[PDB]
Amino acid sequence: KLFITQQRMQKIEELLEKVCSENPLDPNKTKQWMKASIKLSDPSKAIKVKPMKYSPMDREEFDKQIKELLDLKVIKPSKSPHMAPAFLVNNEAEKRRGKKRMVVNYKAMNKATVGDAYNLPNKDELLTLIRGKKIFSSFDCKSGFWQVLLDQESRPLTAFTCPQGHYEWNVVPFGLKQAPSIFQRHMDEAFRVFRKFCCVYVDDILVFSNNEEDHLLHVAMILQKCNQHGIILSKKKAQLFKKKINFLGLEIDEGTHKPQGHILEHINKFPDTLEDKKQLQRFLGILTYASDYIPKLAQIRKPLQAKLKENVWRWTKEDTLYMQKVKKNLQGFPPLHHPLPEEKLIIETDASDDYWGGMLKAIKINETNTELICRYASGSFKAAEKNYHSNDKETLAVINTIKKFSIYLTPVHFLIRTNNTHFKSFVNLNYKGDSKLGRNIRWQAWLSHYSFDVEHIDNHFADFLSREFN
RNA sequence: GUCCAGCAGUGCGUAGC
DNA sequence: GCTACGCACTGCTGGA
């Protein structure tokens, strides 16, 4: 018996081994393909930032990390006229990685260099590409920027300082403004030919297929592409043949998507009683990652945002009991539908005195159909917009929802459900009101770029949440 | 402390009424 | 007073 499929898996596993390494400059695995150029734009000047002070724990670790970096031959001793300070950072990735991360403050040199015009992808334009796919693999480059060689005139620009002195970089360092663009350009050049089953966000390669069979071919082609170009992957971070893949901070399924669980876990580390305002802004910061997933989250967040104002610190038993509910639903909100390419899309929108809301729905086809929720949007009205009439806030809710969902809606005939009985006449340029003509023509122009019908207006999760809060 | 991205916000200039 | 577009800056989070 053959087991030709297990043979293909071992072949994939060997291609993976062939392109993985812990050294981004690995002499057996790089062709020195990727090169970059960084230009002052006023070459006459010198960019000198005052150094920093270093504690012993940091002066120690620096010594360890600098020997590593010197050993990889990514940095080297420098007598450059430019200098930028290095420091260590300890954020949630570092805490769990077990190692402090070194950062060079390149703000001054970034102000001072010619930009790279090359744009990064939009996260929604990548996600819409994988709608319908069943199987995924994902690959992070090993310290990717460090695989791009800097030419001789550009390396002095990278010179930094640290306890052990004055070094510069032989490769593109993290923290330069051009680096994501330089790397994205290279990944697009290596892999654009496989755009039908592969996309890259800077650093991260995603392979997607609608079944295991295709995937064996798809992954092998990407891995043989890395080998051809000397692109070094990180074995520890390879996600091979997964039904659920982590990508762009999301957990994505054939039919569903949610934030990565390890992100919204940190909500449950906050107390029900916040000590100070600085901790409240830490809390609001992470609560941000639920906006696509909680209906009317702008409102839920407003009571808390108030406390942040300098004008206002007084925590109450209600403040405490508010935290508890908020914490309970900001973890364990249900995953949302990732719509198939051919599924018909609907947006339902609503408005209140101070906020707008909208919700994206898809029509799952069943031989009686079904409407699945894909994404939520919410926000509060600008200063001038609170004086809008109640029909125009409802129209604004339509516009803001489309804007948020525009990557999905733009190429498709979709359906808007609103409570503005005059919205239908308005978009058909049949609207009577001449009072605010310029704003109306502006909206009519903007809405003209979309193709849609209109209906007048089953979200029990949102009904639960509203009940449980007031 | 950089950089990308998420969320909220502040200021400013230019152009039109 | 309004609109627009686009520059500068701030706080927090995620991560490289």
Author numbering: 1 to 312, 314 to 368, 370 to 459, 463 to 475
Authors' account:
Reverse transcriptases (RTs) are enzymes with DNA polymerase and RNase H activities. They convert ssRNA into dsDNA and are key enzymes for the replication of retroviruses and retroelements. Caulimoviruses, which infect plants, are pararetroviruses; they have an open-circular dsDNA genome that upon replication is not integrated into the host genome but instead is maintained in the cell in an episomal form. It uses reverse transcriptase as an essential component of its replication process.
